[PDB]
Design a protein around this nucleic acid. Structure first.
Lengths: 49, 299, 49, 49, 49, 49
DNA sequence: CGTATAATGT
């Protein structure tokens, strides 16, 4: 429910960062200029986020 | 600091190349490429010549590096002129360096022309392509980028001649572009505003704070979607089953692709004129009985 | 390298390596080489040659 | 004058006319900015005379 | 900036550019990550329009 | 180019850290703390921390 | 897409 006895902050090893991620961002495009839809594997990719 | 300065010293480390040096290096690198080509075709591979061929390959690679290092200065001399156009100077230099390697990959010394003349065109090409693809956060097609630059240059020249800013119609006459196309092109030219910019100094509140989500009512969407979709499916089921298939195909409730009157007639073997009457029957049926009671809403 | 840990007052990375900020900065921005490991035993064994 | 100096030192010398030299974009841009954004160009409050 | 510079480095390292080119590119990548995690911490902060 | 392997960049620092051990460094710092050398004593104190 | 007189350190 809402039991959070303590709260820890620690350095994030590279392995941890991959675990959090749901994918990889591989292109610098942001959104298409006509459909105004997030582009594939881009910074707004619908597959990843 | 000053990452530009450290790179500038690095490129200045290598001295310039003369015409005699350029041709000598060009011959050496060509031999190295030819030697590397010979590696994969010498089926009866020699023993000592194999080591000699490998040594020449290293020599050719060394010549390639030395030629590139010397020629980096041309790239900087060409990249300097494009600064201040939404791309960092050092980023432009790296894009030009990509152009340099690309040009060197296709360089030929048999024509007797200096490497600078042939490289300049490629360096130019690479830098301008880079700028077009990267300089804008919302990547526009290269075609649009070229058209925008054309309009901007024309607008500057026309304004200088007129002495006053020109309208879309006047620009269209000068540039031979449709007026609506110019309006759309101008809108594309806009560089998006930043949300972090404080607005009206309203308690140092960024513009993004005032943006209204005003969307994403998931609870409302789910109930409406469930009710309407289920109601129509059940109502279509109560109708003739073949007509239910007709609605699915005529429309695409399952697979999209709304079948036209002739097309659906072809699939069912009927004529193009029968579909209108079929739809007339469906609409008439849907407006009577319990179907109306269920579907009176949703309008 | 994460910006926080170097270029700090103190620079946590510097103390861990016992390196002054000048040395650490030069290594990061490729302004100067640095030696990672040297095979001391091999150097001693073949020093005469 | 910075623009005109650059143009003067680079443009042709035989058929140079002041119209092609003098530019009006910076001046008009400057004056417009002053009346549109300067902290000393305030909406005249007209609650009463 | 980070994604674009990293992608260029991936392409550039595959191409086989000389040492100075790759070294400069990695310097750009490190600078971009520096700006991302903290802008203005070191050097002149990257500025907007 | 036989014994010493000197790399340049954050990759060099990464390899230095992974090769670098902490048990021996900690023990040496503690031993130095037991001794005097005030100015170097506090430098070792901060490092040991 | 290769544009060939030549063009080499913010």
């Amino acid at each position: 429910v809402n039991f959070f006895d303590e709260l820890r902050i620690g350095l994030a090893t590279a392995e941890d960062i991959r675990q959090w991620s749901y994918g990889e961002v591989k292109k610098p495009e942001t959104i298409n200029y006509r459909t105004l839809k997030p582009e594939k594997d881009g910074l707004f990719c619908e597959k990843i986020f | 600091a000053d990452l530009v300065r450290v790179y500038l010293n690095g490129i200045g480390k290598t001295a310039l190349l003369n015409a005699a040096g350029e041709v000598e290096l060009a011959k050496r690198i060509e031999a190295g490429l030819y030697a590397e080509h010979l590696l994969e075709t010498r089926k009866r591979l020699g023993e000592n010549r194999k080591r000699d061929l490998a040594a020449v390959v290293r020599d050719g690679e060394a010549a390639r590096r030395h030629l590139l290092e010397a020629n980096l200065r041309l790239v900087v001399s060409l990249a300097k002129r494009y600064t201040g156009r939404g791309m960092p100077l050092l980023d432009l230099i790296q894009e030009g360096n990509l152009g340099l390697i690309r040009a060197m990959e296709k360089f030929d010394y048999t024509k007797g022309f200096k490497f600078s003349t042939y490289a300049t065109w490629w360096i130019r090409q690479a830098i301008t392509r880079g700028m077009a693809d990267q300089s804008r956060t919302i990547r526009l097609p290269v075609h649009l980028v070229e058209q925008v630059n054309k309009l901007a240059r024309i607008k500057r020249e026309m304004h200088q001649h007129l002495g006053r800013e020109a309208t879309d119609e006047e620009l269209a006459a000068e540039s031979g572009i449709p007026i609506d196309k110019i309006n759309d092109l101008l809108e594309h030219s806009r560089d998006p505003v930043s949300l972090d910019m404080p607005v009206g100094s309203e308690e140092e509140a960024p513009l993004g704070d005032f943006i209204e989500d005003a969307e994403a009512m998931s609870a409302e969407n789910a109930v409406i979607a469930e009710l309407l979709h289920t109601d129509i499916r059940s109502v279509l089921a109560t109708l003739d089953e073949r007509e239910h298939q007709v609605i699915r195909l005529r429309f695409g409730l399952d697979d999209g692709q709304p079948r036209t009157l002739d097309q659906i007639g072809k699939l069912f073997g009927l004529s193009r004129e029968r579909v209108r009457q079929i739809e007339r029957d469906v609409m008439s049926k849907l407006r009577h009985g319990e179907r109306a009671d269920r579907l009176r809403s949703y309008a | 390298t994460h910006i926080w840990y170097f270029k700090g007052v103190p620079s946590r990375l510097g103390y861990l390596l016992d390196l002054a900020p000048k040395d650490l900065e030069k290594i990061i921005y490729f302004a100067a080489y640095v030696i990672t490991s040297v095979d001391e035993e091999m150097r001693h064994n073949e020093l005469s040659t | 004058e910075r623009v005109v100096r650059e143009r003067m030192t680079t443009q042709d010398v035989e058929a140079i006319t002041p119209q092609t030299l003098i530019n009006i974009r910076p001046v008009v841009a400057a004056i417009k900015e002053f009346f549109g954004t300067s902290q000393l160009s305030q909406f005249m409050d007209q609650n009463n005379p | 900036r980070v994604i674009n510079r990293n992608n260029r480095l991936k392409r550039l390292i595959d191409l086989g550019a000389p040492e100075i080119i790759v070294n400069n590119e990695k310097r750009m990548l490190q600078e971009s990550v520096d700006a991302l995690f903290d802008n203005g911490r070191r050097g002149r902060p990257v500025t907007g329009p | 180019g036989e014994y010493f392997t000197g790399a340049m960049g954050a990759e060099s620092i990464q390899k230095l850290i992974e090769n670098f051990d902490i048990d021996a460094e900690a023990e040496s710092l503690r031993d130095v703390i037991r001794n005097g050398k005030g100015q170097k004593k506090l430098r070792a104190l901060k490092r040991l921390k």
